[PDB]
Amino acid sequence: RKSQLQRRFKEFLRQYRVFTFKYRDELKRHYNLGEYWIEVEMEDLASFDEDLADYLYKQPAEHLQLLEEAAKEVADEVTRPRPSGEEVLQDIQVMLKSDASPSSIRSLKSDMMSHLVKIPGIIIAASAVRAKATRISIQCRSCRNTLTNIAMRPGLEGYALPRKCPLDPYFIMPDKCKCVDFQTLKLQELPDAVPHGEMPRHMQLYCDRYLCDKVVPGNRVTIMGIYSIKKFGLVGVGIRSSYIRVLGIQVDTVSPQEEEEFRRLAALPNVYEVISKSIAPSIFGGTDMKKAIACLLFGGSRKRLPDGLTRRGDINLLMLGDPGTAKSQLLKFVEKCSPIGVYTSGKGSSAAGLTASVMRDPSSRNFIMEGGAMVLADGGVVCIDEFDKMREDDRVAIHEAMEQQTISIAKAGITTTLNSRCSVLAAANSVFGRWDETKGEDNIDFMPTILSRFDMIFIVKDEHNEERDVMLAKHVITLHVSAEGEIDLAKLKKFIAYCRVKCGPRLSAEAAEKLKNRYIIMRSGARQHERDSDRRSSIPITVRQLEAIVRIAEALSKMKLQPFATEADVEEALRLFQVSTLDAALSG
Amino acid sequence: ELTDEDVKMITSLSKDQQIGEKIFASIAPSIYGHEDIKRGLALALFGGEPKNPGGKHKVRGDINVLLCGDPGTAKSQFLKYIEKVSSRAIFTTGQGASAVGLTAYVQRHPVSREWTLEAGALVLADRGVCLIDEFDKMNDQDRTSIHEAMEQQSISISKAGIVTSLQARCTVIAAANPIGGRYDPSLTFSENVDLTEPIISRFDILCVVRDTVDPVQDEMLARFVVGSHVRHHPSNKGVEPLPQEVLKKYIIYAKERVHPKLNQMDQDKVAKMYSDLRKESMATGSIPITVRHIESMIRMAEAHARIHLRDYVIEDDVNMAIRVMLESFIDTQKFSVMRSMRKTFARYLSFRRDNNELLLFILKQLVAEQVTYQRN
DNA sequence: TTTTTTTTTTTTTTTTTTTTTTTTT
DNA sequence: AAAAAAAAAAAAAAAAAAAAAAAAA
């Protein structure tokens, strides 16, 4: 009898071991945390009692109800003692997952209706969380009696009110009916699985209490659900639109041990060196550029003064060079390694603008914010290749954003200031294509204002060398043949995230003094050089460059988790800024 | 197309020792001449070997090809043949006259009335070939999308609410006409084509198709096309090319099974060649050679090895890849630099080029000079 | 009284025109 | 500085999916 099946589910939940009882303790912790849901591994259920799993696969509709009831009873048995005001037991949604490979959407024929089905896809739209009634109460209009606790079926299955206590005298009381979360999603077939000449198929997913908003459109998802049709008061004849009842969702693509690992990694005397050589090992040369990119990755510290003004702590880097150097490769690595990162071109990307835009839906009249690379990359890195080929609107937008960290947009509907706290890493080629010294300082068309934004500007050249060419060709061939001190991508990314979230340093008095004196000397030298050349170098030095040097020192000290930036790191930051002053001054 | 015992067939002629010439001659049999273009398209079809050392250096295994040429030279014919012969191959045009566009978007499909994510054409050819005709007549957004696909091998969509990144690992075979409708060798390639340098920098082979007046070739092509017209009338409806079905079976087997490894490449020869090319190109005011050229040579050597299913790139494969890469790079240069690099590297460019071909070319040049002197 | 066909309304999308904006001589 | 081409706004039309009311028997 169904009671026997529920009893067996209770035994499986209470006594499945692995020693430790996984599901009993999971119920304890979730109910104590208030989650009131669990994730049941299908294979464990099958192993403990294979008949239960087979029943689930053949008749999910009521067997999952039995499992949920059993889980509710077990949770009561494990967490019954509660303080007054919450002792009432809470139903438990039971999500189920399995390692079984998903079945292509094309195999969802009629026969699989009402069976548990696992399919892959890409969610292209998700509806807002809403209210569906699990328990409703109906009151007669004439006799004003009540029929409380009318069980409501899950899924897209409405309900018909009773006709006889007049006739059809009942109305629903909103204030007495219990409802839960609710959401509808559109799942498209993964483009890889779509046959060559063929449209992509679709399906409609229906979420539930805790499955709502577990995914957002664009996620690559694996869905385990109940293939079901709508049940709404009953040339195509007898066709009922079909949908999936979502039960398990898996979205495809820090432990204390790792925290201590990061702590010891930072404590290394040469942590800077190992990080420097651990970003683009495949790319040969450019040690200074790699050090600068590490500094950019770690970033400085954002400061908000008591007056409320904000000093950005994110470094902005620019790289002008011949089209031969591996700089787009460098940007690709940076976007692949930064915790939050996005690669894009000067003119945005493919159907993904650079800066955010705001438009009002003429029908729904909402304020839709189409996010560009900048807003999407908030708190991370935006790698802009071909940074010299922006569009005027985008040029102004980035002009504002790189300094203030905010994009201010005011449309016919509203004014607003989206927060884009992104570190910009820009790549570019000379105006002519190849850097020619004869027209030095004329190889850059950037207006002086923009060049002020970038903390550092690197200049790359390939004008002449034979030994370097031989070494480069042999190194590339060696890399293609093969295909220690290197922090792997995942470990490095997690270390970067931990350092950024945890440690924010500040300068020390002596460091500030040294940087002050050095900056004064740099300003004097730049002014004298500009006077001697009788022209303004299109690569100025401003107090913004002082902020850049301070930020680089802060990043160097943040690598080590040291709260204060010492004199040595300020000297190293000064050297890094000197490797760009080599373009500020030696260029002319 | 999942057959068995045809592995024997493919291997049976794989050991022919001249299969390279057969396959190079078995591409678009309805197009006369343009043997170098056919070789390049064969190498593109068989493809290279994608490799991502660690997980931070993504190197594409594709061989993108760009055929830039004055009109009336059967470039679109080559693109259509590739469409016909290669599985997962899609065709699109720079104009909007193509069924599917280059850029992704989301909308309700006009016939199905259902809201779907129309992925860009490049995505549809995720592991195949994307043929782009009128490559020099695209939109700004089309140019951005092709740039993104060629650079990062993926597309990022944030149109309605779909913040996603779906990968498009396509081989782009493009066709285009020079600025002004005629290719002028006195100007470098990058300046007589309506394409920015970054776009052209991502193509592994540049085929400069030129329509130069030549009585013998003109007569031969006239005979070819007129015979085609005769043979396809409604009433009547130096090796041997492989049949097209067997050619595509061979392509499938090679592209799916054999993965050549370059453990036998002569690093000495390649390094010396690269250094010499750098010195020569910089000695003149010419577009220089860069690392990506060595990358393309590696990919083409791997593809040529794949044609022969060697599983190990051999010296001759490397030499042939160098031949093709140097031919493209030289033809991209201006007129004077063309001869400069031809004479300076004639040894490399003459690999597997028998004496008869060079002698015929020189005799044709001399007789053309005589003709020009006569008729001026 | 009970069904049924209509009525609406409420969203959403699509197409034409106009207007506004961008690029070129 | 002014004209030509392109892009976007905006307004009107169509599909349509579903809930409620009036007329019919």
Ligand SMILES: Nc1ncnc2c1ncn2[C@@H]1O[C@H](COP(=O)(O)OP(=O)(O)OP(=O)(O)O)[C@@H](O)[C@H]1O
């Ligand atoms: N080498 C050739 N062999 C056979 N037929 C050829 C050859 N060159 C041109 N033709 C024929 O001449 C005609 C012109 O070729 P096609 O229409 O493909 O031009 P195209 O190179 O694509 O030009 P465009 O750049 O203007 O589109 C076609 O009918 C084609 O069959």
Ligand SMILES: Nc1ncnc2c1ncn2[C@@H]1O[C@H](COP(=O)(O)OP(=O)(O)O)[C@@H](O)[C@H]1O
């Ligand atoms: N120093 C280097 N080390 C390793 N590979 C390099 C180096 N320089 C260039 N390359 C190779 O040359 C190719 C060109 O690099 P890329 O970043 O595309 O240039 P750009 O940024 O100008 O487009 C890349 O595929 C890269 O692998």
Ligand SMILES: [Mg+2]
């Ligand atoms: Mg680049």
Ligand SMILES: [Mg+2]
């Ligand atoms: Mg054509």
Ligand SMILES: [Zn+2]
């Ligand atoms: Zn009643």
